[PDB]
Design a protein around this ligand. Structure first.
Ligand SMILES: [Mg+2]
Ligand SMILES: [Mg+2]
Ligand SMILES: [Mg+2]
Ligand SMILES: [Mg+2]
Ligand SMILES: [Mg+2]
Ligand SMILES: [Mg+2]
Ligand SMILES: [Mg+2]
Ligand SMILES: [Mg+2]
Ligand SMILES: [Mg+2]
Ligand SMILES: [Mg+2]
Ligand SMILES: [Mg+2]
Ligand SMILES: [Mg+2]
Ligand SMILES: [Mg+2]
Ligand SMILES: [Mg+2]
Ligand SMILES: [Mg+2]
Ligand SMILES: [Mg+2]
Ligand SMILES: [Mg+2]
Lengths: 202, 63, 117, 146
RNA sequence: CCGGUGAAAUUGAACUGGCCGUGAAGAUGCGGCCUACCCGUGGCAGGACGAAAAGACCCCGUGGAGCUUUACUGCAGCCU
RNA sequence: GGCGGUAGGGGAGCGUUCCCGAUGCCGAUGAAGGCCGACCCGCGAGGGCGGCUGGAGGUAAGGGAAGUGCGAAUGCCGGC
RNA sequence: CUGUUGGGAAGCAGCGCCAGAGAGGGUGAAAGCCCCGUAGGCGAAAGGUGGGGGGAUAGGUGAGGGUACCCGAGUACCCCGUGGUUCGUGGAGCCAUGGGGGAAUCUGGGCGGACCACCGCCUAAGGCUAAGUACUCCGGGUGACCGAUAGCGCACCAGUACCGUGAGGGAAAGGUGAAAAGAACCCCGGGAGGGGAGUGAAAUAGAGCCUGAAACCGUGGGCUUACAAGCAGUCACGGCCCCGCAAGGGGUUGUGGCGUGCCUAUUGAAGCAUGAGCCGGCGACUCACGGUCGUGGGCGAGCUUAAGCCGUUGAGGCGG
RNA sequence: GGGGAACCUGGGGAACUGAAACAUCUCAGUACCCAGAGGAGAGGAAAGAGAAAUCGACUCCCUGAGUAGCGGCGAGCGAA
């Protein structure tokens, strides 16, 4: 809600949040879905009785035949001919109003604050590139591999120091996908984030 | 795709402002070899209808 | 995302076979035949579960009628006295006491010849 | 909230219509039964019957078009001052679009109903029976010209 | 008849009688009555309205197609 | 108090294929599938349980997308 | 690394390690650390490329006054048919022109929807010009795409076999096992095919060799049938054989009660109205755009973007 | 000089179909035939647009816009 923790370079202090702290999950449910369909690459297809290679010639006359009545072999009633109402390729994206994700961005952040599962950072023993130069930072901060974590920073070095971490997924300061936020069971971010997240809302 | 309006209905009808549909009255440019001077009055004025107006509404819709 | 038939269409035909057990010839191994004769059964079993009483409802009476006419009176004349005695007891089955000790029933008869003659 | 357990509310799931069954929907696929049903019934809007439609109306509503079509005379749009009191000052069309009216329909005329803050409104025209309703307030210069 | 090789159309399934009635009213299949051991084989064709090519017949379709014409419109061609 | 029911309307559910759930879990001490059963849940479409076979994948609770549920079309392929 | 089931371990347990590499595939089953590889980094003597940089060259570079020279020809313009533009002769321009009449050099010539006057734009009848745009035989990456009746017709010697003179039509068919270690040898027998031994974890994996359903055929066993009239079942009782603990349960049926198959169209069936020999699989309301109603959520005199631009590559933000 | 899966320019160019018949109209200058240009093709530097004594070669996406308009003013067609 109002209160948030911070690992300063000089100790452990806090800060006052400017953030609405009500709830509405059918918003998030209606935001996750958007994120997941827009990443859907439109690729599935079958072939209707037109993109089938068989010709367009009656198989045997219907008059005086003994059997039934038929025509070209693209006919779905046959076999191997055409698809019925197959799934030609098509986009799944749309345009969800920004005011749903903006507010949707805030809602989820307080959700970790409301549970305390938050941390702004600024001090790092791992301001350089090494996965070992981080897990001890997590040791001296409070991440013992028990539960998952999302991480944000504007430094492409720390990402390296954890890009191979199964329980820690990289995230740039911008695309705070509500998916990965709710995906991970805990969150971490930096001021380099808390100026754009603020310039979004704050 | 992108529904085409019905210009043959635009020129004939006008959509109101309570959703109703109103057209000019019929019978005023043919039968007038002198018949009831009364009639040449309630036919020069617009009238509204009932069910079939929704048959018309859906022929417009962007306008 | 294709979803072929597969399991679904077979298991059902196995259930119809499961209820078509002992049905003559194709009527128990050919599917869309077994489907049929099951329709009639559930109907034939319906009506007859309504009928099984009327069967026994009838049978009991004849046995009763067999008893009263062994005292010397008809079933019609038997029941009335019981009814005149106002005895909502005689479940027409429970009047089977003609081989379930008879005096228990033989002296139900004389309690009929009272209130009528 | 963790990743799962963020389901929708209620009254919202699709479960669209699936009329290929044996007692759910019918073996005639819902709104079908009689005959003449597999392609379409023409357009049940303007047509059908084959009598005379209801296009039997007269279209006197004239000026139904020439050849170059429309012509560029400016659209006069009015504005009710009811919410012109939301702000105040030298209000001009320049910002009246920014507020939420006109929308480049352009050529602003003022009119309407209510108390008018003596706020000097610059526009292109004013409704008479509202201009004295302004006269007891402030000042009202006119547009450029034509 | 014996040895050897070995198809077909048809077929919802069958444990497939007769008669007198009923029944959209031509019943092996409904009611009543009569007859009849189970199963084959040789043959005859009364029934199963039998197999239909979607009857060789009649009608319908705001179907098709050929042909005709002082039906309609256009075209070639011909005159001009 | 009402609950026969065709066209038709509304509501509710079961099953299949795939995705988030997953660098998750079940699986060689045997998965999916196939033979059974007189066991159990459900009125249901269905879900669990014991036995046999098979031998490597299968995926809960809540959300999502469908090439989605067969008894016939003188339907099509194949087999008989 | 070791230990332990297992034919086989990557599984299970313990103790560790790497991390800019925990994405994947393989190895007898499920491997971050066995193998190729991914993160990241280096790289061609030769050909090509060039779109970024550089040199050179092609080309180009002033004004005032006067002159009375030149400015794209059957062309412009007008008419008779005509097409294109949304223009179906409509008030019908403009652009191109098949036919006919036939100009002028800036005192000129076209246009601004008949025509005229003014006002404004343009200078035609010579040609050229990258970029931004479409496509996918080819290569790469990717998939809420299929998985042998599906996916193109072909996963496989397929545009083959087969049909037709001919254009042209055009299929079916994958799966032993990880390893052929594929049955030496013996026996019946003409061989084929089998029995045994043996390999194999398994031959109940045997070379159309993963799974093996259903229709269909046969052998063995429990019940029944040669006085009986039948949509072939249902109900009741007894009877025979089996399971089980009282009691109960399974399978069969002798007798008695009742019993006019399914779907479709039909007012109407049992029907002498359509259809199906049977089984097993493929097979039938989805999608795009616009719109009416309903509903769920966002904001609320406001609500909202589209193409496109920055960025990891299943991140979003700007863009009014 | 010929080939090249589709894409591109030009020369020709239908009818089914829709109008619930059908001739103007639509399908449509689509499908098909021909010739040719290449990695692209075509167009391309105003005898332009269009109303401001304004924009400035050409192509391409969005909006304008199913607006203006075209129509046996019927289906329906469709700019700048
Ligand atoms: Mg929700
Ligand atoms: Mg024919
Ligand atoms: Mg009684
Ligand atoms: Mg007695
Ligand atoms: Mg469905
Ligand atoms: Mg119903
Ligand atoms: Mg029809
Ligand atoms: Mg009508
Ligand atoms: Mg006013
Ligand atoms: Mg017979
Ligand atoms: Mg004729
Ligand atoms: Mg599966
Ligand atoms: Mg052991
Ligand atoms: Mg194939
Ligand atoms: Mg094909
Ligand atoms: Mg085939
Ligand atoms: Mg089947």
């Amino acid at each position: 809600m109002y209160q948030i923790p911070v690992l300063s370079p000089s100790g452990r202090r806090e800060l006052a949040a400017d953030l609405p702290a009500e709830i509405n999950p059918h918003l998030l449910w209606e935001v996750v879905r958007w994120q997941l369909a827009k990443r859907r690459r439109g690729t599935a297809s079958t072939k209707t009785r037109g993109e089938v290679a068989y010709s367009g010639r009656k198989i045997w006359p219907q008059k005086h035949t003994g059997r039934a009545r038929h025509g070209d072999i693209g006919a779905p009633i046959f076999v191997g001919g055409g698809v019925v109402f197959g799934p030609k390729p098509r986009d799944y994206s749309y345009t969800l109003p920004k005011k749903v994700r903006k507010k949707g961005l805030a809602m989820a952040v307080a959700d970790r604050a409301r549970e305390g599962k938050l941390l702004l950072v600024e001090a790092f023993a791992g301001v350089n590139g090494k996965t070992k130069e981080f897990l001890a930072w997590a040791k001296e901060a409070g991440l013992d591999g028990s539960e998952s974590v999302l991480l944000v920073t504007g430094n492409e070095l720390v990402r390296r120091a954890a890009r191979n971490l199964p329980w820690v997924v990289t995230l740039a300061p911008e695309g705070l996908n509500v998916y990965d936020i709710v995906r991970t069971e805990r969150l971490v971010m930096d001021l380099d984030a808390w100026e754009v997240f603020q310039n979004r809302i704050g | 795709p992108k529904m085409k309006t019905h210009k043959g209905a635009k020129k004939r009808v006008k959509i109101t402002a309570s959703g109703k549909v109103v057209a000019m009255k019929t019978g005023k440019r043919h039968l007038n070899w002198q018949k009831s001077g009364k009639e040449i009055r309630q036919k020069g004025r617009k009238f509204v209808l009932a069910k079939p107006e929704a048959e018309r509404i859906k022929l417009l819709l962007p306008y | 995302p294709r979803a072929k038939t597969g399991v679904v269409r077979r298991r059902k035909h196995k259930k119809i076979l499961k209820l078509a057990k002992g049905y003559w010839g194709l009527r128990s191994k050919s599917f869309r035949k077994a489907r049929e004769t099951l329709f009639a059964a559930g109907n034939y079993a319906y009506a007859h579960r309504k009928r099984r009483k009327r069967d026994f409802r009838r049978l009991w009476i004849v046995r009763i009628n067999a008893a009263c006419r062994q005292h010397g009176l008809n079933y019609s004349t038997f029941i009335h006295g019981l009814k005149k005695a106002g005895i909502e007891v005689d479940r027409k089955n429970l009047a089977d006491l003609a081989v379930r000790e008879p005096q228990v029933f033989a002296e139900l008869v004389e309690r009929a010849k009272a209130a009528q003659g | 909230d963790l990743r799962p357990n963020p389901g929708a509310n209620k009254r919202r799931k699709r479960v669209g219509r699936g009329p290929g069954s044996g007692h759910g929907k019918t073996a005639t696929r819902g709104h079908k039964g009689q005959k003449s049903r597999s392609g379409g019934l023409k357009d049940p809007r303007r047509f059908e019957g084959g009598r005379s439609t209801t296009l039997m109306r007269l279209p006197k509503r004239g000026m139904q078009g020439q050849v170059p079509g429309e012509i560029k005379r400016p659209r006069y749009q009015g504005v009710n001052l009811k919410d012109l009191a939301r702000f105040e000052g030298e209000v001009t069309p320049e910002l009246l679009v920014r507020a939420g009216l006109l929308k480049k329909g352009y050529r602003l005329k003022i009119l309407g109903e209510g108390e008018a803050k003596p706020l000097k409104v610059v526009a292109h025209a004013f409704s008479k029976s509202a201009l004295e309703k302004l006269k007891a307030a402030g000042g009202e210069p006119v547009l450029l010209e034509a």
